Amino acid sequence: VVLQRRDWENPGVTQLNRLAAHPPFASWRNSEEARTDRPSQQLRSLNGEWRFAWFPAPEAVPESWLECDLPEADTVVVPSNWQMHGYDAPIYTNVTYPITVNPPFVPTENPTGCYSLTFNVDESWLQEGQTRIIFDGVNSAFHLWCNGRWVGYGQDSRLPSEFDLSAFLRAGENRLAVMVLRWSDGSYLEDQDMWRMSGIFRDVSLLHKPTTQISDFHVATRFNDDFSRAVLEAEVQMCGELRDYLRVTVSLWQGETQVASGTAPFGGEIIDERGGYADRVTLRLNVENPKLWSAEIPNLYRAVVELHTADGTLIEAEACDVGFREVRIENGLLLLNGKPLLIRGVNRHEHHPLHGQVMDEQTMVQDILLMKQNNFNAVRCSHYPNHPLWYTLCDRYGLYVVDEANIETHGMVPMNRLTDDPRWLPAMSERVTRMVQRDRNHPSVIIWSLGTESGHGANHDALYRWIKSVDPSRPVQYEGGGADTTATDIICPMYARVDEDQPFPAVPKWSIKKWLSLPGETRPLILCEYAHAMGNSLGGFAKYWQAFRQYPRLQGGFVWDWVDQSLIKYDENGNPWSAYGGDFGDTPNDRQFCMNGLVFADRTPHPALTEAKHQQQFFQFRLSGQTIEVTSEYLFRHSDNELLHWMVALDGKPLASGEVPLDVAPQGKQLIELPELPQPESAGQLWLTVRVVQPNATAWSEAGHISAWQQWRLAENLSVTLPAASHAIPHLTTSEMDFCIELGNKRWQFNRQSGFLSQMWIGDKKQLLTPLRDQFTRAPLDNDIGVSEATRIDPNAWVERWKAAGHYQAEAALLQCTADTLADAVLITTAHAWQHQGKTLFISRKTYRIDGSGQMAITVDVEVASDTPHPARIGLNCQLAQVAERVNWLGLGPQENYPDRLTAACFDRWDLPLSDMYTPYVFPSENGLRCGTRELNYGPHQWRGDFQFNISRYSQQQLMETSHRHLLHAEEGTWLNIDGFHMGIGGDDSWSPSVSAEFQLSAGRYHYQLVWCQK
């Protein structure tokens, strides 16, 4: 009958014989174990070695598999995704569905995972009460059998399905058989931009509950206006036989202290003409001066819910952590405990490079710590309810959570084709209702979300009202269909820009500043997604935080996103590499679009992470004279674990430093008076650097963790001294093909046919492998490429503008190349015109002045045609012969930084191994730039001026011809790119031009100068 029905092609059937959803249960039989949250003997894990077979369709499954283990089957670990064991390929597709859009039908070729487990059940479990099995995550649908007999069916990949097995089990050995379908009608609601995988990918467990049981419970906390008094209100529901002697005690614990308690018989107040719930009771406990919960200080109490007899004999106990906090939207602001929030948030998919979409404690804890260490206070569960441990950890470490229903229909045309259809309302309701029923007691959850990218349909409106109806404690948000519809309490656009309107028809993304004040609008604005961190990105991130700070109603947003969705593959030798869309044979695919992380799949930071930590700082700084003004952006806590380290350096040389403890109240100010700074009698720029240090370890950080920093230029003393003139004067050696300049061991050569420095010699040895030439291009970034492909060009992307204008294949044409012997130097003048198909793109006018001290002063003046697309950069490159261990520079650093992403970088003297000057982006592009650099040192070379540079063993050309990082080979010598000017990287999104006007190279005429010498 199971093959006959095809429930996996019926959106009307989303479960069979499935128990109601409810908050996390453990069925403790001792109230103390409940209080302390110790393991419970009534909740057994079924995780571990299971038997697995793969089949191309459910019709291909043999009927014997219900009765006997299959010999051809293997033994695999559960939980797991079966794509992660090599049974089939994972598919990466963004928008377009991984299957043909023919609702409600799926392909007849429907990969089918048959899982089985022979396991033991004790006698005690079967003489009394109720034995249920819980599947926390099954992708995407499944039928369940126990000892040959059919139990039930379930959908929704991301919420627990629970089945009563009491009537199916026997003492001793038992066998489960689980038929998991890759594709079902649920897939239509699971079109998240992520790897499409399947199987039993979350925990499986058995729970024993008494016959008379707690079947549900809800905890609410309400406050007076100043938060000095709370009422905890706990509503408890039982199943079983209703008897007079039945009682519930809800008791509230702070550590080992019981702060409050209440006990009542069942039978709530009269509700309507037929009475009340005889199977319910509401307990109300008064709490004076409650410790409030926030992400800053996650104060938790323990609620123990005891079901017992009048006389005091326990039946069972459940429990949860309670955070006393109010979430309300008042007067257009989202308030926590009466204070306006500034969401420093991130989107976080559940992703692991080895285990796929299986989650474990270690990884979750690792994620939380990195998040907090980098100044995040919020996470969006993009785009499904998470592993249940996640909320628990968020409660305990303190993050604000957006809990999001598992509904995404992005690939539909138009996006709301299902969500407007009343026939898909049942399947949608269950994905929202079952989330609320499960997660509503977690204080970390502050906002409910109706899903993502499903357009705006009437079903959203119904479910919005439903949530507001059952849970008035939390705002409901939803971005779809324009981000400000009647199904959202919060204007929550994705990738809406700061100042720039993008007025799309029907779904405009307004400038977020403009959006707030549209006629009639009053709601707060928090971006559900912003700052697409794909490859070398996060350009313009500071612009967001400047606006968030200035506008009370701009209350932050969630970065897209936390971690790259790269997956580990292995080569012939056996070494791992990071893989994206299309690397498992999967087609069609959206390639590197699965990697948008602030961190790599192994949780190593991208350079952008540091930019986020800095902009997301909690202490603001202003300098007047010798006074640092510190302002706190904390809402609740004092800076009771903070000192300020100040430091003054002259072009990187330390002159003074000190420490002052920070004692600033939430939203408050502290003035720090620096001691007399010693005026240096030496040319240079004085810089002030302050760093906020946490001297003590926390649950989330180590002692000496730096949480904030800032810099200022203090006094500058410009160099008025002429260098001591030299005896020697360089000699010019004119040839047919060459101008050679000699001075001591040093020699320069200008090729008269190309017009460039073709070679330099120090003593005997050659310094160049490639001549010094102008460069106007870069290995295109993900943002430069957007959605452009080889077989579907987007002529709007920066890369295509560059290609079509001939930037990548323009040829230097020599207009001029003269030599002149001066009094104490040799002067080489040049002029080039870069042309493509008769159009002059660029003109470079240079002079090289080689003086008697062996220094070469290079002066570059570039004309850029007003009607050519603005170039990626205006600089020079060459390939040096030298491979040295270290790079030393006076500029912004130490990490990679670009004109629109340099706020986190500090001006100082930095020294790193060459390998740190390369950023290993999985899709290779221009990388490792450092800006505002006054001096660069590499081997015997030193460059001086005011430039940006990158330095690496990889040419711009190899970076742009290579698709994966691991396929890069180190070239001979070191590619040096020195830019006078470099275009922003953008990232407001990654599918249109996103580089802001003020970071484009549009001036038409550009000037830079460099001195080159041996030291």
Ligand X SMILES: CC(C)S[C@@H]1O[C@H](CO)[C@H](O)[C@H](O)[C@H]1O
143, 179 in Cβ contact below 8 A? yes
Give Cα 540 distance to the centre of its chain.
16
Instruction: Locate 535 and state its tokens.
Output: 């490859």
Beta-bridge mates of residue 746: 743, 762
Q: Put residue 803 in one of left, alpha, beta given phi > 0 → left and psi -120 to 50 → alpha.
A: alpha
Q: Give bridge partners of residue 818 from the DSSP assignment.
A: 829
> Which residue lies nearer to Na ion by CB, 464 or 593?
593
Residue 123 in marked binding region: no
User: Residues touching Na ion: how many (CB under 5 A)?
Assistant: 6
- Closer CB to its own copies, 270 or 822, in the complex: 822
Which member of 42, 81, 94, 589 binds ligand X (CB under 6 A)?
94
Q: Does 822 bind its own copies (CB under 8 A)?
A: yes
Dihedral of alpha carbons 786, 791, 794, 797, sign: positive
Outline where DSSP puts E strands in 224-377: 229-239, 246-254, 257-265, 280-288, 301-309, 314-322, 327-330, 333-336, 339-340, 343-347
Candidates 298-306, 319-327, 809-817, 920-928; binding stretch for its own copies (CB under 8 A): 809-817
The minimum distance between CB 91 and ligand X, in angstroms, equals: 15
529 binds ligand X (CB under 6 A): yes
Q: Pick one of 154, 869, 875, 924: the residue that binds Na ion (CB under 5 A).
A: 924
Are the beta carbons of 635 and 292 closer than 8 angstroms?
no
Candidates 637, 612, 635, 618; CA nearest to 708 is 618
- The annotation status of 94 as a binding-site residue, yes or no, is yes
Asked if 564 is part of the footprint of ligand X (rule: CB under 6 A), the reply reads no
Footprint of its own copies on residues 556-575 (CB under 8 A)? none
E-strand ranges in 505-575 read 525-530, 554-559, 567-570
- Interaction partner, residue 946 (Mg ion, ligand X, its own copies, none; CB < 5-8 Å by kind): its own copies
How near is the Cβ of 503 to Na ion at its closest, in Å?
24
From the list Mg ion, Na ion, ligand X, none, partner contacted by residue 13 (C-beta under 5 to 8 A by kind): Mg ion
How many C-beta atoms lie closer than 10 Å to residue 590's C-beta?
Answer: 17
Q: φ and ψ at 629, to 5 degrees?
A: -100, 120
State the catalytic residue, choosing from 235, 318, 350, 529: 529
CB of 515 to its own copies, least distance (A): 24
Which of 58, 945 has the CB closer to its own copies? 945
From the list Mg ion, ligand X, its own copies, none, pick the one residue 10 interacts with, judged by a Cβ distance below 5 to 8 Å according to partner type: Mg ion
Q: Letter for the amino acid at 715?
A: A
Determine if residue 589 is labeled as part of a ligand binding site. Answer: yes
**Rounded to the nearest 5°, which phi and psi values hold at 138?**
-135, 120
CB nearer to ligand X: pick between 52 and 593: 593
Q: Which two tokens stand for residue 517?
A: 């004040």
The residue (of 479 and 642) whose beta carbon lies closer to ligand X is 479
864 and 1006 in contact (C-beta within 8 Å)? Answer: yes
The CA distance from 224 to 230, in Å, is 7
**Structure token digits, residue 249:** 């005690």
Nearest to 1015 by CA among 936, 940, 938, 934: 940
Asked if the bond preceding 414 is cis, omega within 30° of 0, the reply is: yes
Contact 28, 316 (CB under 8 A): yes
| CB 597, CB 631: distance < 8 Å | no
The least CB distance from residue 347 to Mg ion, in Å, is 11
Within 10 Å of residue 818's Cβ, how many Cβ atoms?
A: 12
Catalytic-residue membership of 123: no
Min separation Cβ 959 and Mg ion, Å: 29
Give Cα separations from 861 to 18, 59, 688 (angstroms).
74, 73, 33
Q: Which does 216 bind (CB under 5 to 8 A by kind): Mg ion, Na ion, ligand X, none?
A: none
Q: Is 193 in the site for ligand X (CB under 6 A)?
A: yes
Beta-carbon contacts of residue 687 (< 8 Å; ≥ 6 apart) = 648, 649, 650, 711, 712, 713, 714, 907, 908
- Sole window of 52-60, 156-164, 734-742, 1002-1010 interacting with its own copies (rule: CB under 8 A): 1002-1010
Piece in contact with Na ion (CB under 5 A), picked from 365-373, 754-762, 781-789, 923-931? 923-931
Beta bridge partners of 441: none
Give 704: exposed, middle or buried? Use CB within 10 Å, 0-12, 13-18, 19+.
Answer: exposed
User: In this complex, which beta carbon is closest to its own copies, that of residue 641 or of residue 829?
Assistant: 829
* 453 flagged as catalytic: yes
Residue 95 or residue 623: which is nearer to ligand X going by CB? 95
> What single-letter DSSP state applies at residue 391?
H
Under the criterion CB under 8 A, does residue 833 sit at the interface with its own copies? yes
Q: Which of 473, 596, 767, 950 binds ligand X (CB under 6 A)?
A: 596
For tokens 């992307």, the residue is: 797
Residue 6 to residues 2, 146, 176, 279, 932: CA-CA distances in angstroms? 7, 20, 21, 37, 64
Q: Which of residues 970-999 bind ligand X (CB under 6 A)?
A: 991
Task: Please give the single-letter amino acid code of residue 981.
Answer: F
Beta carbon nearer to ligand X, 193 or 908 = 193
Query: Is 331 marked within a binding site?
Result: no
* Positions 856 through 875 that interact with its own copies (CB under 8 A): 861, 863, 865-867
Assess 563 for contact with ligand X (CB under 6 A).
Answer: no
Q: Is 529 annotated as a binding residue?
A: yes
Residue 191 interacts with Na ion (CB under 5 A): yes or no: no
- Of 685-704, binders to its own copies (CB under 8 A) are 685
Give the C-alpha separation, 100 to 106, whole Å: 8
465 near its own copies (CB under 8 A): no
Interacting residues toward Mg ion by CB under 5 A: 7, 10, 13, 185, 193, 410, 453
529: partner contacted, choices Mg ion, its own copies, ligand X, none (Cβ within 5-8 A by kind): ligand X
Catalytic member of 453, 800, 896, 935: 453
Cβ distance to ligand X smaller for residue 491 or 828: 491
Q: Is 233 in the site for its own copies (CB under 8 A)?
A: no
Q: Is 593 annotated as a binding residue?
A: yes
CA Rg, the chain, in Å?
A: 33
Is residue 193 at the binding interface for Na ion, with CB under 5 A as the rule? yes
Residues that bind ligand X (CB under 6 A): 94-95, 193, 494, 529, 593, 596, 991
Binding residues: 94, 193, 408, 410, 453, 529-532, 589, 593, 596, 991
Residues that bind Na ion (CB under 5 A): 193, 548, 554, 593, 596, 924
Catalytic residue IDs = 453, 529
Question: In the complex, which residues of this chain contact its own copies (CB under 8 A)?
Answer: 685, 713-718, 720, 722, 813, 815-816, 818-823, 827, 831, 833, 840, 843, 861, 863, 865-867, 946, 1005, 1007, 1009
